[PDB]
Amino acid sequence: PLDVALKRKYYEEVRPELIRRFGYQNVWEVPRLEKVVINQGLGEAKEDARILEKAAQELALITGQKPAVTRAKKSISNFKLRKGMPIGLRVTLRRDRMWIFLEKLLNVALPRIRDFRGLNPNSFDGRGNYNLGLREQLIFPEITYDMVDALRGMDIAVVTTAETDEEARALLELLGFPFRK
Amino acid sequence: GKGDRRTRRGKIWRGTYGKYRPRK
Amino acid sequence: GIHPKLVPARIICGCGNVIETYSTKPEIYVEVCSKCHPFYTGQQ
Amino acid sequence: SLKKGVFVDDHLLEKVLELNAKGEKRLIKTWSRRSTIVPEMVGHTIAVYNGKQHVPVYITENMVGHKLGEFAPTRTYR
Amino acid sequence: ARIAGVEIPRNKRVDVALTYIYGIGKARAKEALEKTGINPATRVKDLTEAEVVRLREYVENTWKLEGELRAEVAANIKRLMDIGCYRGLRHRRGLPVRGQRTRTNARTRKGPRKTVAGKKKAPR
RNA sequence: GGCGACACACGUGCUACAAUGCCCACUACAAAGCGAUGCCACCCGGCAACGGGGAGCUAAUCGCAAAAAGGUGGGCCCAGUUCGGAUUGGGGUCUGCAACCCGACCCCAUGAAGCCGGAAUCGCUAGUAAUCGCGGAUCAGCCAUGCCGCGGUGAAUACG
RNA sequence: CGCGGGGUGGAGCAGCCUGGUAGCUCGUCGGGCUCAUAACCCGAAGGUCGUCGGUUCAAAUCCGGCCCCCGCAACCA
RNA sequence: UCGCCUCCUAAAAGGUAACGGAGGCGCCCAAAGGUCCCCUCAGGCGGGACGGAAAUCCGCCGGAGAGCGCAAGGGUAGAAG
């Protein structure tokens, strides 16, 4: 486990072009993807013996990382469970792990997502780094569809070096990300 | 039985043939 | 001690391309992917 | 349920394919609801009728083997 | 005797057991046996360790079966969540999508008898 | 476009719940009716509705068109099943300018409720009841489980 | 304290010694019979059988044990 | 109304009155306790599938306005959390 397409394709292709693109000098200033936090949460754990640890585990086969047993601060009287202990779910992605999942997320779950037409043209604006809003889930090259007790959306947050937008844009812009433009 | 578009009697009931009632 | 394992895989697209990476389950039957775009249709 | 052809009217393409030869607008009234959906015409807006008014039904790339009618409901409260 | 999905026929003529599988009808099955020269009569409890898988082979590996078909269906159902096909609604709307009679029947697509009735007449 | 709507309602009926049954194969026995831009024998292509060719038939003379329930053999062994086919996905045919709203078939796949029906209620006095197949009118086609006819097998009971 | 006895549809009360049904009504909803209405007449929504622990093939029920009511007789530094 | 805890009244020490002004207590917790090892907020403004106007996220700016069983108040992240 020491190499992918991206991770490689990032270096030999993304590094040189970028650098030469905006005009940096040393290898660090050039912006780079750092990590990718991605959480589901659900918030669909309430009355009637509502476990959903599979909900997690099943996300574990899509990522490679066995998610985090999240909880929620306050208490939501205006809707179910209160004062910590419920459910929120999350799996932070860091290099290799992140590269892989990232890889096939730029090869499979691009059209498999129902229709599609291209990624939002502005979901990081101002503050570098990009977040995505998910509905589906089986569009993943795994997670069979005759094993989905339910379909839950999720959040893929892909944080970077690029301190501006033009940058974080580029980064992905030139790497494998398709924008609705 | 009389409905099952998949048997002798049926095609019959439904006055017709096919692969479950050879048009001879 | 509690993970998804992993192993080298050889994924087979639906038109030609055959990306050779890793993850979980060695044989993958994909419908489409890259090498499948920008497949437009013109416009009146 | 054809086998030889596609019942789609002609007074449509004599309008849709001219507009085709350029890449124009989309306001295209019409009563020919009884007609297949023309391949490529995906991206165009047809004002299907329903005994009431024309309909801003767009047109996707996934509604071709479907006559214009399938997207122009007739009765209210569905 | 697993084969397709977590399915296992047993104790009865092979040519019928097969139907059990999701995706297998009367036709297909009895073809499964002719194709692979396998005999119908013969139960499920009497099939060489070979014929067994030998079967599953052709089987599982041709017409997609239970599972990979299951919601393979909803594919062209949900696919109808598009701009909205009349047939979309009906599923979208929980009713008959084959130009049927709702006015009175249709109890397979509607929950059985949802009474809530009224109508007044005239007193004195 | 609508009369086809649909949270519901009653009336008339279709298919069933199964072993006195169902399936596949074979094999007998009708009567009544309708047939020219009609009914299509008969070869051919598709596991098939159907398509190509093509003989006859103004029809007691050629066809629809073979009757089903019987019989005979084989398959099922009491299960929500090889019962029952509703709904749903798919691929197709003919018609007709055109079948989204709105056809019928065929074919692959799903196989739903129903294991005998509350109070109540309907029919029938014998070739009847019951159950089985066949026709025609209207018709381009058909939503025909209807309607008007036909013929097959063939009970029970009536003290009062 | 102790002997009892008692809680089960929205209120009412049987199922309590017998194990094997979750019901009998009032009341809302339909649907029945008339010539229509009334009146009778049916089928349903609805209860952890209070609680938990338990033996059984199985519990409202027999066992447990406690919260809780009401009768009494008694206790109150 | 009657014992008790908090604040003001109460005049910068303490205390200090009214049938003064305004709230609580008659419980809880075998972890909500010993301890040792780890960790950090509330909000605001961007960015986000269900998403209020605060769910769970991501990014900045924000030392305390969060929390601490419960009344208020003292106190507190250099930890009591």
mmCIF file with all atom_site columns, C-alpha atoms in Angstrom, chain A:
data_model
loop_
_atom_site.group_PDB
_atom_site.id
_atom_site.type_symbol
_atom_site.label_atom_id
_atom_site.label_alt_id
_atom_site.label_comp_id
_atom_site.label_asym_id
_atom_site.label_entity_id
_atom_site.label_seq_id
_atom_site.pdbx_PDB_ins_code
_atom_site.Cartn_x
_atom_site.Cartn_y
_atom_site.Cartn_z
_atom_site.occupancy
_atom_site.B_iso_or_equiv
_atom_site.pdbx_formal_charge
_atom_site.auth_seq_id
_atom_site.auth_comp_id
_atom_site.auth_asym_id
_atom_site.auth_atom_id
_atom_site.pdbx_PDB_model_num
ATOM 1   C CA . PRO A 1 1   ? 0.000   0.000  0.000   1.00 0.00 ? 1   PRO A CA 1
ATOM 2   C CA . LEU A 1 2   ? 2.284   2.789  -1.170  1.00 0.00 ? 2   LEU A CA 1
ATOM 3   C CA . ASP A 1 3   ? 0.761   4.032  -4.432  1.00 0.00 ? 3   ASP A CA 1
ATOM 4   C CA . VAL A 1 4   ? -2.343  5.096  -6.390  1.00 0.00 ? 4   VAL A CA 1
ATOM 5   C CA . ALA A 1 5   ? -3.121  6.884  -9.644  1.00 0.00 ? 5   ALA A CA 1
ATOM 6   C CA . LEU A 1 6   ? -3.989  10.228 -8.094  1.00 0.00 ? 6   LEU A CA 1
ATOM 7   C CA . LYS A 1 7   ? -1.284  10.509 -5.438  1.00 0.00 ? 7   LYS A CA 1
ATOM 8   C CA . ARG A 1 8   ? 1.042   9.790  -8.356  1.00 0.00 ? 8   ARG A CA 1
ATOM 9   C CA . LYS A 1 9   ? -0.941  11.604 -10.991 1.00 0.00 ? 9   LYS A CA 1
ATOM 10  C CA . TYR A 1 10  ? -0.945  14.527 -8.506  1.00 0.00 ? 10  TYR A CA 1
ATOM 11  C CA . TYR A 1 11  ? 2.858   14.741 -8.358  1.00 0.00 ? 11  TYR A CA 1
ATOM 12  C CA . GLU A 1 12  ? 4.038   14.207 -11.950 1.00 0.00 ? 12  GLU A CA 1
ATOM 13  C CA . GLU A 1 13  ? 1.049   16.275 -13.291 1.00 0.00 ? 13  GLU A CA 1
ATOM 14  C CA . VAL A 1 14  ? -0.600  18.421 -10.615 1.00 0.00 ? 14  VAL A CA 1
ATOM 15  C CA . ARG A 1 15  ? 2.618   19.661 -8.954  1.00 0.00 ? 15  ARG A CA 1
ATOM 16  C CA . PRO A 1 16  ? 4.468   20.939 -12.019 1.00 0.00 ? 16  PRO A CA 1
ATOM 17  C CA . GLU A 1 17  ? 1.469   22.524 -13.765 1.00 0.00 ? 17  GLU A CA 1
ATOM 18  C CA . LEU A 1 18  ? 0.119   24.224 -10.638 1.00 0.00 ? 18  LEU A CA 1
ATOM 19  C CA . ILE A 1 19  ? 3.531   25.653 -9.667  1.00 0.00 ? 19  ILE A CA 1
ATOM 20  C CA . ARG A 1 20  ? 4.101   26.966 -13.182 1.00 0.00 ? 20  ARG A CA 1
ATOM 21  C CA . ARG A 1 21  ? 0.370   27.982 -13.137 1.00 0.00 ? 21  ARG A CA 1
ATOM 22  C CA . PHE A 1 22  ? 0.145   30.687 -10.372 1.00 0.00 ? 22  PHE A CA 1
ATOM 23  C CA . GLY A 1 23  ? 3.802   31.210 -9.596  1.00 0.00 ? 23  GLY A CA 1
ATOM 24  C CA . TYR A 1 24  ? 5.076   29.796 -6.296  1.00 0.00 ? 24  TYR A CA 1
ATOM 25  C CA . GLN A 1 25  ? 8.710   28.862 -5.744  1.00 0.00 ? 25  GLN A CA 1
ATOM 26  C CA . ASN A 1 26  ? 9.345   26.178 -3.099  1.00 0.00 ? 26  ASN A CA 1
ATOM 27  C CA . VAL A 1 27  ? 7.570   22.863 -2.628  1.00 0.00 ? 27  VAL A CA 1
ATOM 28  C CA . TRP A 1 28  ? 5.099   23.578 0.242   1.00 0.00 ? 28  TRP A CA 1
ATOM 29  C CA . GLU A 1 29  ? 3.858   27.084 -0.724  1.00 0.00 ? 29  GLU A CA 1
ATOM 30  C CA . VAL A 1 30  ? 2.302   25.340 -3.679  1.00 0.00 ? 30  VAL A CA 1
ATOM 31  C CA . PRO A 1 31  ? -1.136  24.495 -2.291  1.00 0.00 ? 31  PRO A CA 1
ATOM 32  C CA . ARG A 1 32  ? -1.925  20.872 -1.601  1.00 0.00 ? 32  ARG A CA 1
ATOM 33  C CA . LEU A 1 33  ? -4.790  18.793 -0.441  1.00 0.00 ? 33  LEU A CA 1
ATOM 34  C CA . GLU A 1 34  ? -4.172  17.899 3.207   1.00 0.00 ? 34  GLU A CA 1
ATOM 35  C CA . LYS A 1 35  ? -7.121  15.759 4.444   1.00 0.00 ? 35  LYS A CA 1
ATOM 36  C CA . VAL A 1 36  ? -10.851 14.988 4.002   1.00 0.00 ? 36  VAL A CA 1
ATOM 37  C CA . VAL A 1 37  ? -13.238 14.825 6.877   1.00 0.00 ? 37  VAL A CA 1
ATOM 38  C CA . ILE A 1 38  ? -16.510 13.081 5.876   1.00 0.00 ? 38  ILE A CA 1
ATOM 39  C CA . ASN A 1 39  ? -19.449 12.558 8.213   1.00 0.00 ? 39  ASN A CA 1
ATOM 40  C CA . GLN A 1 40  ? -23.006 11.156 7.856   1.00 0.00 ? 40  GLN A CA 1
ATOM 41  C CA . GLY A 1 41  ? -24.370 11.767 11.349  1.00 0.00 ? 41  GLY A CA 1
ATOM 42  C CA . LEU A 1 42  ? -27.830 10.576 10.409  1.00 0.00 ? 42  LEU A CA 1
ATOM 43  C CA . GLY A 1 43  ? -29.616 11.935 13.438  1.00 0.00 ? 43  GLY A CA 1
ATOM 44  C CA . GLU A 1 44  ? -32.140 9.208  12.758  1.00 0.00 ? 44  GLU A CA 1
ATOM 45  C CA . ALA A 1 45  ? -31.510 7.369  16.083  1.00 0.00 ? 45  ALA A CA 1
ATOM 46  C CA . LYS A 1 46  ? -34.421 7.834  18.479  1.00 0.00 ? 46  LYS A CA 1
ATOM 47  C CA . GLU A 1 47  ? -37.301 5.679  19.891  1.00 0.00 ? 47  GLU A CA 1
ATOM 48  C CA . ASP A 1 48  ? -38.073 1.930  19.230  1.00 0.00 ? 48  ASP A CA 1
ATOM 49  C CA . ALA A 1 49  ? -34.644 0.247  19.723  1.00 0.00 ? 49  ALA A CA 1
ATOM 50  C CA . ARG A 1 50  ? -32.827 2.475  17.204  1.00 0.00 ? 50  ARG A CA 1
ATOM 51  C CA . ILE A 1 51  ? -29.233 1.179  17.109  1.00 0.00 ? 51  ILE A CA 1
ATOM 52  C CA . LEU A 1 52  ? -27.648 1.655  13.647  1.00 0.00 ? 52  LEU A CA 1
ATOM 53  C CA . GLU A 1 53  ? -24.079 0.563  14.298  1.00 0.00 ? 53  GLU A CA 1
ATOM 54  C CA . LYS A 1 54  ? -24.237 -1.117 10.913  1.00 0.00 ? 54  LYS A CA 1
ATOM 55  C CA . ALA A 1 55  ? -25.043 2.277  9.504   1.00 0.00 ? 55  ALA A CA 1
ATOM 56  C CA . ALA A 1 56  ? -21.414 2.960  10.501  1.00 0.00 ? 56  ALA A CA 1
ATOM 57  C CA . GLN A 1 57  ? -19.763 -0.329 9.801   1.00 0.00 ? 57  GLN A CA 1
ATOM 58  C CA . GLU A 1 58  ? -21.349 -0.218 6.296   1.00 0.00 ? 58  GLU A CA 1
ATOM 59  C CA . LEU A 1 59  ? -19.670 3.170  5.758   1.00 0.00 ? 59  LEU A CA 1
ATOM 60  C CA . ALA A 1 60  ? -16.481 1.470  6.901   1.00 0.00 ? 60  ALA A CA 1
ATOM 61  C CA . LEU A 1 61  ? -16.460 -0.678 3.728   1.00 0.00 ? 61  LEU A CA 1
ATOM 62  C CA . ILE A 1 62  ? -16.828 2.378  1.542   1.00 0.00 ? 62  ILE A CA 1
ATOM 63  C CA . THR A 1 63  ? -14.038 4.364  3.238   1.00 0.00 ? 63  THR A CA 1
ATOM 64  C CA . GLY A 1 64  ? -11.725 1.886  4.930   1.00 0.00 ? 64  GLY A CA 1
ATOM 65  C CA . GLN A 1 65  ? -11.950 3.755  8.203   1.00 0.00 ? 65  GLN A CA 1
ATOM 66  C CA . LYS A 1 66  ? -14.424 2.595  10.917  1.00 0.00 ? 66  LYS A CA 1
ATOM 67  C CA . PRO A 1 67  ? -16.337 5.845  11.680  1.00 0.00 ? 67  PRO A CA 1
ATOM 68  C CA . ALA A 1 68  ? -16.738 7.801  14.900  1.00 0.00 ? 68  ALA A CA 1
ATOM 69  C CA . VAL A 1 69  ? -19.456 7.363  17.465  1.00 0.00 ? 69  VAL A CA 1
ATOM 70  C CA . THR A 1 70  ? -20.540 11.067 17.356  1.00 0.00 ? 70  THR A CA 1
ATOM 71  C CA . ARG A 1 71  ? -22.949 12.729 19.720  1.00 0.00 ? 71  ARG A CA 1
ATOM 72  C CA . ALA A 1 72  ? -24.849 16.102 19.899  1.00 0.00 ? 72  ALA A CA 1
ATOM 73  C CA . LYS A 1 73  ? -24.221 18.895 22.431  1.00 0.00 ? 73  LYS A CA 1
ATOM 74  C CA . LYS A 1 74  ? -27.425 20.581 23.549  1.00 0.00 ? 74  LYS A CA 1
ATOM 75  C CA . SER A 1 75  ? -30.860 19.002 23.881  1.00 0.00 ? 75  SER A CA 1
ATOM 76  C CA . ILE A 1 76  ? -33.412 19.229 21.153  1.00 0.00 ? 76  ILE A CA 1
ATOM 77  C CA . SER A 1 77  ? -36.847 19.260 22.717  1.00 0.00 ? 77  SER A CA 1
ATOM 78  C CA . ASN A 1 78  ? -38.243 20.666 19.460  1.00 0.00 ? 78  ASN A CA 1
ATOM 79  C CA . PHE A 1 79  ? -37.216 17.232 18.122  1.00 0.00 ? 79  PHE A CA 1
ATOM 80  C CA . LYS A 1 80  ? -36.028 14.038 19.876  1.00 0.00 ? 80  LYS A CA 1
ATOM 81  C CA . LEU A 1 81  ? -32.926 13.157 22.006  1.00 0.00 ? 81  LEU A CA 1
ATOM 82  C CA . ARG A 1 82  ? -31.124 15.638 24.210  1.00 0.00 ? 82  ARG A CA 1
ATOM 83  C CA . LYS A 1 83  ? -27.961 16.337 26.239  1.00 0.00 ? 83  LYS A CA 1
ATOM 84  C CA . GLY A 1 84  ? -25.294 14.231 24.526  1.00 0.00 ? 84  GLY A CA 1
ATOM 85  C CA . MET A 1 85  ? -25.388 10.422 23.902  1.00 0.00 ? 85  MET A CA 1
ATOM 86  C CA . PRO A 1 86  ? -27.433 10.193 20.655  1.00 0.00 ? 86  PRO A CA 1
ATOM 87  C CA . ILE A 1 87  ? -25.934 9.898  17.225  1.00 0.00 ? 87  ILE A CA 1
ATOM 88  C CA . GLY A 1 88  ? -23.770 11.737 14.771  1.00 0.00 ? 88  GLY A CA 1
ATOM 89  C CA . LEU A 1 89  ? -21.323 9.798  12.580  1.00 0.00 ? 89  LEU A CA 1
ATOM 90  C CA . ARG A 1 90  ? -17.908 10.628 11.148  1.00 0.00 ? 90  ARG A CA 1
ATOM 91  C CA . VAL A 1 91  ? -14.760 9.359  9.466   1.00 0.00 ? 91  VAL A CA 1
ATOM 92  C CA . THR A 1 92  ? -11.811 11.715 8.880   1.00 0.00 ? 92  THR A CA 1
ATOM 93  C CA . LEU A 1 93  ? -9.709  10.857 5.840   1.00 0.00 ? 93  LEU A CA 1
ATOM 94  C CA . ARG A 1 94  ? -5.920  11.234 5.791   1.00 0.00 ? 94  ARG A CA 1
ATOM 95  C CA . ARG A 1 95  ? -3.458  10.418 2.952   1.00 0.00 ? 95  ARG A CA 1
ATOM 96  C CA . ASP A 1 96  ? -3.443  6.952  1.253   1.00 0.00 ? 96  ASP A CA 1
ATOM 97  C CA . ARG A 1 97  ? -6.812  6.290  2.892   1.00 0.00 ? 97  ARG A CA 1
ATOM 98  C CA . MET A 1 98  ? -7.923  9.682  1.621   1.00 0.00 ? 98  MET A CA 1
ATOM 99  C CA . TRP A 1 99  ? -6.209  9.182  -1.751  1.00 0.00 ? 99  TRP A CA 1
ATOM 100 C CA . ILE A 1 100 ? -7.922  5.848  -2.452  1.00 0.00 ? 100 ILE A CA 1
ATOM 101 C CA . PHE A 1 101 ? -11.491 6.729  -1.465  1.00 0.00 ? 101 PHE A CA 1
ATOM 102 C CA . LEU A 1 102 ? -10.833 10.027 -3.180  1.00 0.00 ? 102 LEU A CA 1
ATOM 103 C CA . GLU A 1 103 ? -9.651  8.182  -6.304  1.00 0.00 ? 103 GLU A CA 1
ATOM 104 C CA . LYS A 1 104 ? -12.733 6.106  -6.987  1.00 0.00 ? 104 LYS A CA 1
ATOM 105 C CA . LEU A 1 105 ? -14.859 9.068  -5.865  1.00 0.00 ? 105 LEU A CA 1
ATOM 106 C CA . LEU A 1 106 ? -13.551 10.791 -8.982  1.00 0.00 ? 106 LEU A CA 1
ATOM 107 C CA . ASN A 1 107 ? -14.043 7.694  -11.147 1.00 0.00 ? 107 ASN A CA 1
ATOM 108 C CA . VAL A 1 108 ? -17.313 5.916  -9.980  1.00 0.00 ? 108 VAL A CA 1
ATOM 109 C CA . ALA A 1 109 ? -19.608 7.922  -7.707  1.00 0.00 ? 109 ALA A CA 1
ATOM 110 C CA . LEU A 1 110 ? -19.615 10.762 -10.193 1.00 0.00 ? 110 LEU A CA 1
ATOM 111 C CA . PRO A 1 111 ? -22.539 9.758  -12.433 1.00 0.00 ? 111 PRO A CA 1
ATOM 112 C CA . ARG A 1 112 ? -23.890 6.889  -10.356 1.00 0.00 ? 112 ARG A CA 1
ATOM 113 C CA . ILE A 1 113 ? -25.293 9.692  -8.243  1.00 0.00 ? 113 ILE A CA 1
ATOM 114 C CA . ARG A 1 114 ? -28.746 9.578  -9.858  1.00 0.00 ? 114 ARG A CA 1
ATOM 115 C CA . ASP A 1 115 ? -28.587 11.974 -12.787 1.00 0.00 ? 115 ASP A CA 1
ATOM 116 C CA . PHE A 1 116 ? -25.753 14.461 -12.240 1.00 0.00 ? 116 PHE A CA 1
ATOM 117 C CA . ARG A 1 117 ? -24.684 17.488 -14.318 1.00 0.00 ? 117 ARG A CA 1
ATOM 118 C CA . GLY A 1 118 ? -21.503 18.517 -12.533 1.00 0.00 ? 118 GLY A CA 1
ATOM 119 C CA . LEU A 1 119 ? -20.349 19.569 -9.048  1.00 0.00 ? 119 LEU A CA 1
ATOM 120 C CA . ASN A 1 120 ? -21.502 22.867 -7.520  1.00 0.00 ? 120 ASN A CA 1
ATOM 121 C CA . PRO A 1 121 ? -19.516 25.823 -8.926  1.00 0.00 ? 121 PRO A CA 1
ATOM 122 C CA . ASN A 1 122 ? -18.970 27.339 -5.467  1.00 0.00 ? 122 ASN A CA 1
ATOM 123 C CA . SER A 1 123 ? -18.950 25.424 -2.142  1.00 0.00 ? 123 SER A CA 1
ATOM 124 C CA . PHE A 1 124 ? -15.796 26.607 -0.386  1.00 0.00 ? 124 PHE A CA 1
ATOM 125 C CA . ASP A 1 125 ? -16.075 30.283 -1.291  1.00 0.00 ? 125 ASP A CA 1
ATOM 126 C CA . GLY A 1 126 ? -13.958 32.659 0.731   1.00 0.00 ? 126 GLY A CA 1
ATOM 127 C CA . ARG A 1 127 ? -12.710 30.093 3.234   1.00 0.00 ? 127 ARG A CA 1
ATOM 128 C CA . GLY A 1 128 ? -10.458 27.679 1.346   1.00 0.00 ? 128 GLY A CA 1
ATOM 129 C CA . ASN A 1 129 ? -11.443 23.975 1.372   1.00 0.00 ? 129 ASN A CA 1
ATOM 130 C CA . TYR A 1 130 ? -14.579 22.313 -0.127  1.00 0.00 ? 130 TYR A CA 1
ATOM 131 C CA . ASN A 1 131 ? -17.613 20.483 1.394   1.00 0.00 ? 131 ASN A CA 1
ATOM 132 C CA . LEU A 1 132 ? -20.163 18.340 -0.550  1.00 0.00 ? 132 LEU A CA 1
ATOM 133 C CA . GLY A 1 133 ? -23.742 17.364 0.262   1.00 0.00 ? 133 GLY A CA 1
ATOM 134 C CA . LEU A 1 134 ? -24.696 13.747 -0.248  1.00 0.00 ? 134 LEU A CA 1
ATOM 135 C CA . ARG A 1 135 ? -28.108 12.045 -0.625  1.00 0.00 ? 135 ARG A CA 1
ATOM 136 C CA . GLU A 1 136 ? -27.353 8.578  -2.007  1.00 0.00 ? 136 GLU A CA 1
ATOM 137 C CA . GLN A 1 137 ? -24.707 6.037  -1.103  1.00 0.00 ? 137 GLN A CA 1
ATOM 138 C CA . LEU A 1 138 ? -24.864 2.733  -3.039  1.00 0.00 ? 138 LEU A CA 1
ATOM 139 C CA . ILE A 1 139 ? -23.373 4.479  -6.075  1.00 0.00 ? 139 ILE A CA 1
ATOM 140 C CA . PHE A 1 140 ? -20.180 3.355  -4.399  1.00 0.00 ? 140 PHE A CA 1
ATOM 141 C CA . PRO A 1 141 ? -18.185 0.566  -6.055  1.00 0.00 ? 141 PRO A CA 1
ATOM 142 C CA . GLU A 1 142 ? -19.100 -1.721 -3.153  1.00 0.00 ? 142 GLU A CA 1
ATOM 143 C CA . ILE A 1 143 ? -21.898 -1.403 -0.563  1.00 0.00 ? 143 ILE A CA 1
ATOM 144 C CA . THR A 1 144 ? -24.165 -3.771 -2.546  1.00 0.00 ? 144 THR A CA 1
ATOM 145 C CA . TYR A 1 145 ? -27.722 -2.453 -3.152  1.00 0.00 ? 145 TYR A CA 1
ATOM 146 C CA . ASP A 1 146 ? -29.496 -5.584 -1.932  1.00 0.00 ? 146 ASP A CA 1
ATOM 147 C CA . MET A 1 147 ? -28.084 -5.028 1.514   1.00 0.00 ? 147 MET A CA 1
ATOM 148 C CA . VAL A 1 148 ? -29.105 -1.386 2.047   1.00 0.00 ? 148 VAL A CA 1
ATOM 149 C CA . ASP A 1 149 ? -31.617 -1.320 4.872   1.00 0.00 ? 149 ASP A CA 1
ATOM 150 C CA . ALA A 1 150 ? -31.795 2.405  4.153   1.00 0.00 ? 150 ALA A CA 1
ATOM 151 C CA . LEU A 1 151 ? -30.206 5.116  2.026   1.00 0.00 ? 151 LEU A CA 1
ATOM 152 C CA . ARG A 1 152 ? -28.487 7.963  3.948   1.00 0.00 ? 152 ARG A CA 1
ATOM 153 C CA . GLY A 1 153 ? -26.739 11.080 2.679   1.00 0.00 ? 153 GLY A CA 1
ATOM 154 C CA . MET A 1 154 ? -23.454 12.358 4.018   1.00 0.00 ? 154 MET A CA 1
ATOM 155 C CA . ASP A 1 155 ? -20.795 15.071 4.080   1.00 0.00 ? 155 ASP A CA 1
ATOM 156 C CA . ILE A 1 156 ? -17.436 14.927 2.416   1.00 0.00 ? 156 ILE A CA 1
ATOM 157 C CA . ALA A 1 157 ? -15.322 17.865 3.533   1.00 0.00 ? 157 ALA A CA 1
ATOM 158 C CA . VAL A 1 158 ? -12.041 18.026 1.577   1.00 0.00 ? 158 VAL A CA 1
ATOM 159 C CA . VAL A 1 159 ? -9.663  20.501 3.337   1.00 0.00 ? 159 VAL A CA 1
ATOM 160 C CA . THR A 1 160 ? -6.517  22.028 1.718   1.00 0.00 ? 160 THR A CA 1
ATOM 161 C CA . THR A 1 161 ? -3.366  24.152 1.705   1.00 0.00 ? 161 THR A CA 1
ATOM 162 C CA . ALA A 1 162 ? -4.727  26.589 -0.918  1.00 0.00 ? 162 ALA A CA 1
ATOM 163 C CA . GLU A 1 163 ? -5.425  29.673 1.141   1.00 0.00 ? 163 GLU A CA 1
ATOM 164 C CA . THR A 1 164 ? -7.587  31.218 -1.517  1.00 0.00 ? 164 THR A CA 1
ATOM 165 C CA . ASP A 1 165 ? -10.335 29.845 -3.674  1.00 0.00 ? 165 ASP A CA 1
ATOM 166 C CA . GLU A 1 166 ? -8.684  30.228 -7.105  1.00 0.00 ? 166 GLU A CA 1
ATOM 167 C CA . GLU A 1 167 ? -6.222  27.858 -5.533  1.00 0.00 ? 167 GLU A CA 1
ATOM 168 C CA . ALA A 1 168 ? -8.321  25.139 -3.850  1.00 0.00 ? 168 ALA A CA 1
ATOM 169 C CA . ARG A 1 169 ? -10.360 25.424 -7.058  1.00 0.00 ? 169 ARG A CA 1
ATOM 170 C CA . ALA A 1 170 ? -7.385  24.746 -9.259  1.00 0.00 ? 170 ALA A CA 1
ATOM 171 C CA . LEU A 1 171 ? -6.000  21.995 -7.081  1.00 0.00 ? 171 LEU A CA 1
ATOM 172 C CA . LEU A 1 172 ? -9.094  19.801 -7.664  1.00 0.00 ? 172 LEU A CA 1
ATOM 173 C CA . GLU A 1 173 ? -10.028 21.712 -10.783 1.00 0.00 ? 173 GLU A CA 1
ATOM 174 C CA . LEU A 1 174 ? -6.854  20.102 -12.135 1.00 0.00 ? 174 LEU A CA 1
ATOM 175 C CA . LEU A 1 175 ? -6.841  16.630 -10.661 1.00 0.00 ? 175 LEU A CA 1
ATOM 176 C CA . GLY A 1 176 ? -10.177 15.010 -11.505 1.00 0.00 ? 176 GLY A CA 1
ATOM 177 C CA . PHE A 1 177 ? -13.077 17.162 -10.253 1.00 0.00 ? 177 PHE A CA 1
ATOM 178 C CA . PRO A 1 178 ? -15.897 18.063 -12.743 1.00 0.00 ? 178 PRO A CA 1
ATOM 179 C CA . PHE A 1 179 ? -17.726 21.349 -12.288 1.00 0.00 ? 179 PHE A CA 1
ATOM 180 C CA . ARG A 1 180 ? -21.279 22.171 -13.418 1.00 0.00 ? 180 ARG A CA 1
ATOM 181 C CA . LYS A 1 181 ? -19.527 25.338 -14.458 1.00 0.00 ? 181 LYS A CA 1
#
